[PDB]
């Protein structure tokens, strides 16, 4: 058969309907996967190098198998307690090693970290000679799960290539010719993706990598997960502010306001938690398109959450304008993700969903204000393995 092994994986982007920022402090979130996907090819090579390239983000970047073997030699793994948190020393070593290149630095660190750690875990003292090529539909500046989808693609591709998971046409199930990893495989994919996400933003909740891994609709709290996609089907318009914002700064804002105003900020986080719980029950127990009644509750939950997020100081004038506009059209808007920029989501009422002209009006308004509207596809699959023609 083939001289050169070749793997292909994809992972979806995401929105958070409820519980961003709160989820960092052990509260509940509700998150949904998108039709926007990150795509990764990994092939065998014979040059004794490891390389990564990513469209519109990273030029060809490589290391010798020799240099990385020396890192693997000095790396430690706990044989008794699975590393739930980062080996900060390796991270700094890797950061030092990659500072010379011309969030692309943390992407490289994240890659090397799980590569080295997965080799150590699997008892390889030397990494295999490989090339990785990545592309995405997900903009980095949008807060739609760019980094998570990248993390998940790396995790699944490396776990499989190094033989730590074996995903066969017997072991795994088929969706439209693609393979879905098993439950156990999904957990392990998710774990190593989480480690990458922690390098990108230290106090990531793990909701992002979890929804990217598993796909569909999830209720998430403190790295524990419930699938809830077998319920109401929402219609959501994504609206990008074109404002780019560091996630870490937004997290810092909330961490600070929590120290400064404990008796305000903490009850606000609890209120968000309650919104997420209520939402999760509405979505779970319903079926089909929301009625007018169900939509009004859903819209109310969205507006309450945007208000509470604004209270945490993580909104932005342009996010505000988007949500205010949503309200003028009878809709309900909130930021999704880190805030301070990025995207809002506008949950659409039953009419706006049936009738194109309604949808087109709101869309044209957001365009007139120089935002990019994009109608979300929801409920799609999580990480997938693909067959490679040729
Ligand atoms: C702001 C936040 O809640 C969502 C990031 O999209 C951070 C996290 O949960 O990792």
Residue numbers in the entry: 1 to 102, 119 to 406
The publication says:
Mevalonate kinases (MK) catalyse the phosphorylation of mevalonate. Mevalonate kinases belong to the GHMP kinase superfamily, which includes enzymes such as galactokinase, homoserine kinase, MK and phosphomevalonate kinase. The His tag was not resolved in the structure. Like all GHMP superfamily enzymes, each monomer is composed of two domains: an N-terminal domain and a C-terminal domain separated by a cleft.
As part of this study, the crystal structure of MKvar with mevalonate in the active site was determined to 2 Å resolution and the crystal structure of MKbur was determined to 2.2 Å resolution. A loop region between α3 and α4 in MKvar is not seen in the X-ray structure, suggesting high mobility of this loop; mobility in this region is also observed in some other MK structures. A conserved Arg residue in MKrat (Arg241), corresponding to Arg261 in MKvar, was found to be essential in binding the tail of ATP and moves inside the active site upon binding the substrates; no equivalent arginine residue can be found in MKbur or MKmaz, where it is replaced by a serine. In MKvar, Thr119 and Ile215 align with Thr104 and Ile196, respectively, in human MK. The distance between Thr119 (the N-terminus of the α4 helix) and the ribose of the ATP molecule is ∼3 Å in MKvar, compared with a distance of ∼7 Å to the N-terminus of the α1 helix in MKbur.
